[PDB]
Amino acid sequence: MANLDRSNDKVYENVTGLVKAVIEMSSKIQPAPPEEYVPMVKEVGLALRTLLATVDESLPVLPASTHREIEMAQKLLNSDLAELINKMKLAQQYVMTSLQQEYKKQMLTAAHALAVDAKNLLDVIDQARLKMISQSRPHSATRELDELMASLSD
């Protein structure tokens, strides 16, 4: 047997951890070699795909109020994934040519907004849980994810 206080803490964790990388990687994104791209994109794909599930679990765990946001957050994750993996896989082949920093620039932009998203997740819903405390009684999507997963695996 085990309590259900494991994922509840992971949500507020990943939303932060994934962000930390978004910054660091964003610093060496330019010089980011083709050998460091494999793992780099791997991390992003994890927080992204995982976020879809994590967030879905945050819906019930948290008080209804940010359903709309969470709803659009799911679909967004899907598209974001492709766009992300794409830009990454691009620089991987556009490095031996010359257009390296190029794909890196446009990538940083999108990747930047994406990161903030995962953070705004708990940031938004937070207003719901808090609103409760300070008042009374203080207390084919998977297809793409799976497909892209293999594309990165082998």
Swiss-Prot record:
Protein family membership: Belongs to the protein kinase superfamily. Tyr protein kinase family. FAK subfamily.
Notes concerning its domains: The C-terminal region is the site of focal adhesion targeting (FAT) sequence which mediates the localization of FAK1 to focal adhesions.
Localization: Cell junction, Focal adhesion; Cell membrane; Cytoplasm, Perinuclear region; Cytoplasm, Cell cortex
Name of this protein: Focal adhesion kinase 1
Residues of the full protein shown: 916 to 1053 of 1053
Phosphotyrosine modifications at: 12
Species per Swiss-Prot/TrEMBL record: Gallus gallus (Chicken)
Function text: Non-receptor protein-tyrosine kinase that plays an essential role in regulating cell migration, adhesion, spreading, reorganization of the actin cytoskeleton, formation and disassembly of focal adhesions and cell protrusions, cell cycle progression, cell proliferation and apoptosis. Required for early embryonic development, embryonic angiogenesis, normal cardiomyocyte migration and proliferation, and normal heart development. Regulates axon growth and neuronal cell migration, axon branching and synapse formation; required for normal development of the nervous system.
Gene: PTK2
PTM summary: Phosphorylated on tyrosine residues upon activation, e.g. upon integrin signaling. Isoform 2 is phosphorylated on serine or threonine residues, but apparently not on tyrosine residues.
Transmembrane feature ranges: none
Subunit field text: Interacts with ARHGAP26, GRB7, DCC, PIK3R1, PXN and SRC. Interacts with the ARP2/3 complex.
